[PDB]
Amino acid sequence: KDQSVTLLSIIRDYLKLSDKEREAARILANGLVKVDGKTVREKKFAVGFMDVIEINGESYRVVYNDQGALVLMKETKERASMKLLKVRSKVIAPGNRIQLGTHDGRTFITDDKSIKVGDVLAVSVPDMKISEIIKMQPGNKAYITAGSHVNQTGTISKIEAKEGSNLVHFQEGFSTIKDHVFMIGSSKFSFV
């Protein structure tokens, strides 16, 4: 499935559920839509997993359904002030000058060489402050973003890595490739 969709499409899909899709374009146009706490009126603006979408003062989270498509779910005001960003890419230069590229296209610059692709940053939406790192490692909990176990959660039991052509295993009795595993909880912090 598409890993990003237009802001207009995801709002229209949601509004379909109450037979109000006809108003999607007017609601967007009225400056009544925010993404990650910033007003957006551009219908072509792409949104993806974990984005916080506000429609008319009400908060929603972009998540996946059991078919793997991006959809909105109702979110509490309290949780809406937070977002998890998966580290999707790194550029490592000399002297621990490290660019972290997150799954929503943001970049942060760190000198912590311990942060790996697959680790997750818990950030505050009102100001982008990073508050926690959720490590991709055994004993931590994840949500599955693609493949056959999409929209399931589990606690990692073991991780296997090789060079050339892998797998994260879960206590719950399944495994997937790392690409599909999105960290959401540790002992000290949980999205849930």
Side-chain angles (χ1 to χ4, degrees), residues 1-21 24-25 27-76 78-165 167-187 189-192:
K1 301 280 203 142
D2 291 327
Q3 303 295 296
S4 65
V5 293
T6 66
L7 173 66
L8 173 61
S9 79
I10 209 161
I11 290 169
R12 188 170 191 270
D13 290 344
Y14 184 73
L15 286 182
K16 267 177 176 47
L17 306 177
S18 58
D19 207 27
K20 300 184 162 298
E21 75 272 7
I27 299 171
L28 225 211
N30 191 195
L32 293 179
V33 181
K34 290 176 180 65
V35 180
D36 291 351
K38 193 247 164 200
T39 293
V40 175
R41 289 181 58 256
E42 177 47 65
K43 75 186 192 75
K44 300 178 177 49
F45 185 82
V47 300
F49 187 62
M50 280 287 316
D51 286 359
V52 177
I53 295 189
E54 185 180 277
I55 305 177
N56 253 107
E58 286 301 319
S59 278
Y60 301 84
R61 178 78 61 181
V62 182
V63 294
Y64 288 91
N65 64 19
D66 290 342
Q67 292 63 236
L70 292 163
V71 298
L72 300 179
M73 72 158 283
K74 192 64 185 71
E75 181 64 294
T76 70
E78 171 156 38
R79 304 179 173 166
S81 69
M82 103 155 290
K83 188 182 185 180
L84 296 184
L85 300 181
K86 185 183 177 170
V87 177
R88 172 178 74 179
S89 71
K90 291 172 66 176
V91 174
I92 306 170
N96 302 320
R97 161 96 183 182
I98 297 156
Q99 304 167 51
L100 306 176
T102 62
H103 80 278
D104 67 347
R106 288 164 182 157
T107 301
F108 297 83
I109 293 151
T110 183
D111 60 18
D112 188 347
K113 70 202 163 181
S114 77
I115 301 169
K116 308 304 175 175
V117 168
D119 288 336
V120 162
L121 306 180
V123 306
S124 171
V125 172
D127 58 20
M128 297 284 109
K129 195 73 176 293
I130 298 158
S131 61
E132 293 291 311
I133 302 152
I134 317 178
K135 296 293 300 179
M136 173 172 283
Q137 63 186 215
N140 290 353
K141 178 169 292 175
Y143 177 87
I144 307 304
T145 55
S148 61
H149 286 93
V150 65
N151 201 37
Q152 296 179 23
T153 57
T155 283
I156 294 171
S157 56
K158 90 169 163 191
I159 298 173
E160 295 177 324
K162 180 110 171 187
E163 206 165 56
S165 289
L167 293 180
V168 183
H169 293 84
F170 293 90
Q171 290 180 355
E172 294 70 6
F174 70 94
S175 70
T176 66
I177 61 177
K178 279 186 178 187
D179 303 45
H180 303 340
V181 179
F182 189 109
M183 316 303 298
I184 63 174
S186 70
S187 297
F189 178 83
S190 282
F191 190 64
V192 176

